[PDB]
Design a protein around this ligand. Structure first.
Ligand SMILES: [Mg+2]
Ligand SMILES: [Mg+2]
Ligand SMILES: [Mg+2]
Ligand SMILES: [Mg+2]
Ligand SMILES: [Mg+2]
Ligand SMILES: [Mg+2]
Ligand SMILES: [Mg+2]
Ligand SMILES: [Mg+2]
Ligand SMILES: [Mg+2]
Ligand SMILES: [Mg+2]
Ligand SMILES: [Mg+2]
Ligand SMILES: [Mg+2]
Ligand SMILES: [Mg+2]
Ligand SMILES: [Mg+2]
Ligand SMILES: [Mg+2]
Ligand SMILES: [Mg+2]
Ligand SMILES: [Mg+2]
Ligand SMILES: [Mg+2]
Ligand SMILES: [Mg+2]
Ligand SMILES: [Mg+2]
Ligand SMILES: [Mg+2]
Ligand SMILES: [Mg+2]
Ligand SMILES: [Mg+2]
Ligand SMILES: [Mg+2]
Ligand SMILES: [Mg+2]
Ligand SMILES: [Mg+2]
Ligand SMILES: [Mg+2]
Ligand SMILES: [Mg+2]
Ligand SMILES: [Mg+2]
Ligand SMILES: [Mg+2]
Lengths: 106, 88, 117, 65
RNA sequence: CUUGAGUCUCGUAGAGGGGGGUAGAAUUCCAGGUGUAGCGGUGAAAUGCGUAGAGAUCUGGAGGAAUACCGGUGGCGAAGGCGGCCCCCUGGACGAAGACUGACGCUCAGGUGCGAAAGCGUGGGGAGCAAACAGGAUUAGAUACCCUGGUAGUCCACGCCGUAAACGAUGUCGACUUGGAGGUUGUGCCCUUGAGGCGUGGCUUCCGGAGCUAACGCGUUAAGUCGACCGCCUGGGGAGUACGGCCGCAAGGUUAAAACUCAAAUGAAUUGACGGGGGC
């Protein structure tokens, strides 16, 4: 199992979904023995450029450590969802459990 | 390549000692493991020549090591080609 | 019909022609006139003086809406485009800002082979 | 000039937008190292971080948006 | 036996390769909105486009191909080559400190594989570009040349083709031989450490000593001093052609002559000309 830093932006109107979407997702991860090393929400946040005629989406960061199979299932979940306007998962060399220039400054 | 656990296990399996990682048998076994692994890879990525180069290199190196072993002491060579199922 | 008093101008400026057209924050165009739409042809239609006269005959052609300020979307390095923008500056418009909107592809398409001599 | 070596960050992460916008023109384009004096390794790290940020719409690709 | 060659442990850098996603510019098209007579092109126009509403501008969509800035003769790769971002699979190199094997090495005819672009087959796809072709500018004649179009191709899959100034015009491997300046990537020690100072590797660029070379130049990354092995050359033209063999669907590739003909052909450098060029 490897480390990952999943960051996704969800349609701001659906911001009532995040406190349950993160629960379901980290539930899948921990059930896959995935150790959530960090979870952060930065709420709504202004967009640098429009996305599908839309601004100020809702950002969520989460550093996890899980096997690639379940995170592939997770990104498929992302794809089939619609509220999450755009996600990005990227591997990382270790587990990072620290602050972030978003929560540290906002 | 090979996970550290796989290499450690194979070293234990063919190594005369614990830390004997240079013996011809453990080298042949490691190369054989990696070749058998890469079989599945190249069964799918047929156009990936750049790594097939390294695969062919390690195949030829296994061949050279086997020949050295066989002409040094044929007994161990036979035992090894039996454990790994080679020269066939 | 209506009033804007601070519009936006667009000078599409090729090396062979220079067209100028204004709208108001919305892209709904108001008045257009070309350097070639003024009897000029050949190299004559590609002169900064043609830009002067096109600026004039757009300003007057839209003065019915009576605008007083301007954004300018200069696009394409037409020969001497400061000419027409300051012509409009003198035409009774406090130009707010200029913007080079010359479209730049990120290696998107293969350009045609240029002139050979 | 030799900034990140004086600071010693192990990796210029894409999240620190505050420390990125000073390596970016007002047009959004990346500024070369020969102007900012950053070491080439950290210049590469900066380029990758900036591109990731542009993807996440933390930074803009250009001003034309 | 361990110094060559390998294996293991810890790491580092990277447009190395394969697969799949995804992003934002831009081009073209479509949809409408605003909004009319020009647009486009050129030596100048014409062909063309525009009253069926273009062009310009705004919004939406579709689709293909390529990845500005970073970007650096910077990096990676055996070479050809490799450039958004993310993931998956995977090759190589390098460093530190050890441990392990114990000559397991170098080279290589034949052989096998890889091999830019164009090209060929089959099926896709097709925005831009564009051989051929078409039209406009058009002379005893249209070809020149320029425009406006524009198919193959360019793209993908799978097969062939196997050639390039495929170049560093420099075969691979090893040892040795004064320096200086860089770039890049490690790493050890250390000043109070950051910065910064001493080291010590790998790769890479440019000067230049001895030496070498016909000279130009090369010069620790040799074209120096040596060793091992392979490839290749023997005047120019005829000719990388003919014949034959092999290979290929084909285009052709590969191997490779002779007759005849000339008394040269060629390399580097030197001195002048070369004014419808510069400067004084
Ligand atoms: Mg290996
Ligand atoms: Mg790669
Ligand atoms: Mg677009
Ligand atoms: Mg329209
Ligand atoms: Mg290299
Ligand atoms: Mg690797
Ligand atoms: Mg021993
Ligand atoms: Mg051969
Ligand atoms: Mg082949
Ligand atoms: Mg091709
Ligand atoms: Mg074809
Ligand atoms: Mg076809
Ligand atoms: Mg064309
Ligand atoms: Mg043409
Ligand atoms: Mg013709
Ligand atoms: Mg021609
Ligand atoms: Mg092919
Ligand atoms: Mg050849
Ligand atoms: Mg080349
Ligand atoms: Mg040659
Ligand atoms: Mg050598
Ligand atoms: Mg060094
Ligand atoms: Mg020199
Ligand atoms: Mg050197
Ligand atoms: Mg030599
Ligand atoms: Mg010589
Ligand atoms: Mg002869
Ligand atoms: Mg022939
Ligand atoms: Mg023949
Ligand atoms: Mg035949």
């Amino acid at each position: 199992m490897r480390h990952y830093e999943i960051v996704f932006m969800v349609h701001p109107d659906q911001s009532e979904q995040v406190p349950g979407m993160i629960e379901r997702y980290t539930a899948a991860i921990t059930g896959a023995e995935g150790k959530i090393h960090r979870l952060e929400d930065w709420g709504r946040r202004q967009l640098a450029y429009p996305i599908n005629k839309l601004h100020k989406a809702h950002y969520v960061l989460m550093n996890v450590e899980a096997p690639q199979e379940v995170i592939d299932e997770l990104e498929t979940t992302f794809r089939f969802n619609d509220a999450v306007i755009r996600s990005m998962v990227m591997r990382t060399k270790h587990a990072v459990t620290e602050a972030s220039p978003m929560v540290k400054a906002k | 390549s090979l996970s550290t656990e796989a290499t450690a296990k194979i070293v234990s399996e063919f190594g005369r000692d614990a830390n004997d990682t240079g013996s011809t048998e453990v080298q042949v076994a490691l190369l054989t493991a990696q070749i058998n692994h890469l079989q599945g890879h190249f069964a799918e990525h047929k156009k990936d020549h750049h790594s097939r180069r390294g695969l062919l290199r390690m195949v030829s190196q296994r061949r050279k090591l086997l020949d050295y072993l066989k002409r040094k002491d044929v007994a161990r060579y036979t035992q090894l080609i039996e454990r790994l199922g080679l020269r066939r | 019909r209506k009033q804007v008093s601070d519009g936006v101008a667009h000078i599409h400026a090729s090396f062979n022609n220079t067209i100028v057209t204004i709208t108001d924050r919305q892209g709904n165009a108001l008045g257009w006139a070309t350097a070639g739409g003024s009897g000029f042809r050949g190299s004559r239609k590609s002169t900064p003086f043609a830009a002067q006269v096109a600026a004039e005959r757009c300003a007057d052609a839209v003065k019915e809406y009576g605008i007083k300020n301007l954004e300018v979307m200069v696009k394409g390095p037409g020969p001497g485009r400061e000419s027409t923008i300051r012509a409009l500056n003198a035409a009774g418009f406090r130009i707010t800002n200029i913007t080079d909107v010359t479209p730049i592809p990120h290696n998107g398409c293969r350009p045609p082979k240029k002139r050979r001599v | 000039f030799c900034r990140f070596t004086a600071e010693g960050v192990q990796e210029i992460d894409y999240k620190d937008i505050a420390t990125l916008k000073n390596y970016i023109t007002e047009s959004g384009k990346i500024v070369p190292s020969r102007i900012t004096g950053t070491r080439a390794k950290y210049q590469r790290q900066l380029a990758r971080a900036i591109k990731r940020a542009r993807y996440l719409s933390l930074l803009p690709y250009t001003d034309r948006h």
